[PDB]
Enzyme design. Structure first.
Site, PDB file in Angstrom:
ATOM      1  N   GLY A  18     -27.331  11.481  13.591  1.00  0.00           N
ATOM      2  CA  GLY A  18     -28.133  12.614  14.242  1.00  0.00           C
ATOM      3  C   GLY A  18     -29.741  12.513  13.988  1.00  0.00           C
ATOM      4  CE  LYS A  43     -29.887  19.516   7.619  1.00  0.00           C
ATOM      5  NZ  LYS A  43     -28.932  20.342   7.786  1.00  0.00           N
ATOM      6  CG  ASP A 138     -28.053  29.855  14.488  1.00  0.00           C
ATOM      7  OD1 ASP A 138     -27.321  29.805  13.656  1.00  0.00           O
ATOM      8  OD2 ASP A 138     -29.251  29.235  14.726  1.00  0.00           O
ATOM      9  CE  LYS A 140     -26.767  26.804  17.745  1.00  0.00           C
ATOM     10  NZ  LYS A 140     -26.622  26.061  16.849  1.00  0.00           N
ATOM     11  CG  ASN A 143     -23.462  25.285  14.554  1.00  0.00           C
ATOM     12  OD1 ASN A 143     -23.496  26.452  15.094  1.00  0.00           O
ATOM     13  ND2 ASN A 143     -24.481  24.298  14.090  1.00  0.00           N
ATOM     14  CG  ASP A 156     -26.675  22.069  11.449  1.00  0.00           C
ATOM     15  OD1 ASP A 156     -27.451  21.313  10.665  1.00  0.00           O
ATOM     16  OD2 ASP A 156     -26.554  21.775  12.914  1.00  0.00           O
ATOM     17  CB  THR A 165     -26.505  26.524  23.147  1.00  0.00           C
ATOM     18  OG1 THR A 165     -26.350  25.001  22.912  1.00  0.00           O
ATOM     19  CG2 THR A 165     -26.083  26.795  24.322  1.00  0.00           C
TER      20      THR A 165
HETATM   21  C1  LIG Z   1     -25.138  16.646   7.340  1.00  0.00           C
HETATM   22  C2  LIG Z   1     -23.718  17.075   7.413  1.00  0.00           C
HETATM   23  C3  LIG Z   1     -22.878  15.934   8.142  1.00  0.00           C
HETATM   24  C4  LIG Z   1     -22.134  15.271   7.131  1.00  0.00           C
HETATM   25  N1  LIG Z   1     -21.308  14.183   7.657  1.00  0.00           N
HETATM   26  C5  LIG Z   1     -21.297  13.919   8.911  1.00  0.00           C
HETATM   27  N2  LIG Z   1     -22.177  14.544   9.691  1.00  0.00           N
HETATM   28  C6  LIG Z   1     -22.874  15.423   9.318  1.00  0.00           C
HETATM   29  N3  LIG Z   1     -23.778  16.361  10.478  1.00  0.00           N
HETATM   30  C7  LIG Z   1     -23.554  17.981  10.651  1.00  0.00           C
HETATM   31  C8  LIG Z   1     -24.932  18.408  11.236  1.00  0.00           C
HETATM   32  N4  LIG Z   1     -25.064  17.489  12.504  1.00  0.00           N
HETATM   33  C9  LIG Z   1     -26.135  18.254  13.441  1.00  0.00           C
HETATM   34  C10 LIG Z   1     -27.726  17.944  13.010  1.00  0.00           C
HETATM   35  N5  LIG Z   1     -28.297  18.776  12.313  1.00  0.00           N
HETATM   36  C11 LIG Z   1     -29.664  18.174  12.012  1.00  0.00           C
HETATM   37  C12 LIG Z   1     -30.839  18.742  11.570  1.00  0.00           C
HETATM   38  C13 LIG Z   1     -31.746  17.987  11.592  1.00  0.00           C
HETATM   39  C14 LIG Z   1     -33.226  18.382  10.823  1.00  0.00           C
HETATM   40  F1  LIG Z   1     -33.426  17.301   9.972  1.00  0.00           F
HETATM   41  F2  LIG Z   1     -32.758  19.390  10.303  1.00  0.00           F
HETATM   42  F3  LIG Z   1     -33.951  18.428  11.873  1.00  0.00           F
HETATM   43  C15 LIG Z   1     -31.391  16.548  11.994  1.00  0.00           C
HETATM   44  C16 LIG Z   1     -30.505  16.289  12.558  1.00  0.00           C
HETATM   45  C17 LIG Z   1     -29.462  17.049  12.706  1.00  0.00           C
HETATM   46  N6  LIG Z   1     -28.186  16.738  13.044  1.00  0.00           N
HETATM   47  C18 LIG Z   1     -25.346  15.978  12.368  1.00  0.00           C
HETATM   48  C19 LIG Z   1     -24.495  15.426  11.526  1.00  0.00           C
END
Ligand SMILES: CCc1cncnc1N1CCN(Cc2nc3cc(C(F)(F)F)ccc3[nH]2)CC1
Length: 316
Positions: A18, A43, A138, A140, A143, A156, A165
């Site tokens: 993501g 992240k 928030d 949704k 999450n 998140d 949203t």
């Molecule tokens: C890290 C936890 C997770 C663990 N394992 C597999 N999937 C997960 N996720 C859970 C969160 N999900 C949504 C998401 N939040 C984000 C926040 C950002 C930000 F950098 F904050 F801008 C960037 C991309 C993002 N994508 C992406 C995949």
């Protein structure tokens, strides 16, 4: 030869999971040390633009605190946190289970037996958050994720993408008229509705036409819903925040006491002994099967406080 330093070069980028405005989420393999070969989600946040905004910094710091302090079966587990000059790094468990509401698309609709289980796990997470005095706000569908076993994992707790949203927001959030933890039980109602009907309870044409339908708060009950599910929804989706179920000191317990959950053994549920409705296939630990394909390759592109003391290694 003391404790492992845990810098960014300890991980190999596998794939994007993501992208957001503030940073990116990668799937990574730890390539040296205490878990050499294990799969995580990494992240990565851009310090320089976080600190340009207070509310943004606030969320970052909060998350970093929440994920160290709050540890729960149905909440994503932070494993490492560290930083370089311009970037912040959070190493969380890789949740191979993907989004839960992604199944909603192939199911069309969740059966009440199924939705219950997932709402039950979610409620236990929300209840614990409130106990630590954290309100998730928030909430949704995006999450709610699933681990390798298919159990709920909330996520998140920090920033948003894009730089989302609104149909899962409680009325008192949109009015900006103050809110207690009762705001999260509305979100549960709106999630229940989405599970059992396919879409949100109230939706409009644009930004403000959607708000009007939420403010008016008109119950659209489809006939196939059982007596109990109809009752719980009209008790979770009350306009008056004080009248809402779980709004009182009972909180999660008050919600969990509803007949809708009469079949949930909470002991076994929390112990994650109850087999989840959807257990995702394996064929690996690095399986990205239900993380769809907008994402591929692997590339990461003086007021330093206070990301001071950001470092963390999970005790486990
Ligand atoms: C890290 C936890 C997770 C663990 N394992 C597999 N999937 C997960 N996720 C859970 C969160 N999900 C949504 C998401 N939040 C984000 C926040 C950002 C930000 F950098 F904050 F801008 C960037 C991309 C993002 N994508 C992406 C995949």
């Amino acid at each position: 030869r003391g404790p492992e330093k845990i810098r960014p070069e300890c991980f190999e980028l596998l794939r994007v999971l993501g992208k957001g405005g503030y940073g990116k989420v990668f799937q990574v393999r730890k390539v040296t040390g205490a878990n050499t070969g294990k799969i995580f989600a990494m992240k990565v946040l851009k310090k320089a633009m976080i600190v340009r905004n207070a509310k943004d910094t606030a969320h970052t710091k909060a998350e970093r605190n929440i994920l160290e302090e709050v540890k729960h079966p149905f909440i994503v587990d932070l494993i490492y946190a560290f930083q370089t000059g311009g970037k912040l790094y959070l190493i969380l468990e890789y949740l191979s289970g993907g989004e839960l509401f992604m199944q909603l698309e192939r199911e069309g609709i969740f059966m009440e037996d199924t939705a219950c289980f997932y709402l039950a796990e979610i409620s236990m997470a929300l209840g614990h958050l409130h106990q630590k005095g954290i309100i998730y706000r928030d909430l949704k569908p995006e999450n709610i994720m699933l681990n390798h076993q298919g159990h709920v994992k909330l996520t998140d707790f920090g920033l948003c993408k894009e730089s989302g949203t609104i149909e899962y927001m409680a009325p008192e959030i949109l009015m900006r008229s103050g809110h207690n933890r009762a705001v999260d039980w509305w979100s549960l109602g709106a999630l229940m509705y989405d599970m059992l009907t396919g879409a949100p309870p109230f939706t409009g044409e644009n930004r403000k036409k959607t708000i009007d339908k939420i403010l008016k708060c008109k119950l659209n009950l489809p006939p196939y819903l059982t007596q109990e599910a109809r009752d719980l929804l009209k008790k979770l989706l009350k306009r008056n925040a004080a009248s809402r179920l779980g709004a009182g000191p009972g909180d999660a317990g008050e919600v969990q006491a509803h007949p809708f959950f009469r079949h949930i053994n909470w002991e076994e549920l929390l112990a994650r002994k109850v087999e989840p409705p959807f257990k995702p296939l394996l064929q690996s630990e690095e399986d990205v099967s239900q993380f769809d394909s907008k994402f591929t390759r692997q590339t990461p592109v003086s007021a330093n406080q206070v990301f001071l003391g950001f470092a963390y290694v999970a005790p486990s």
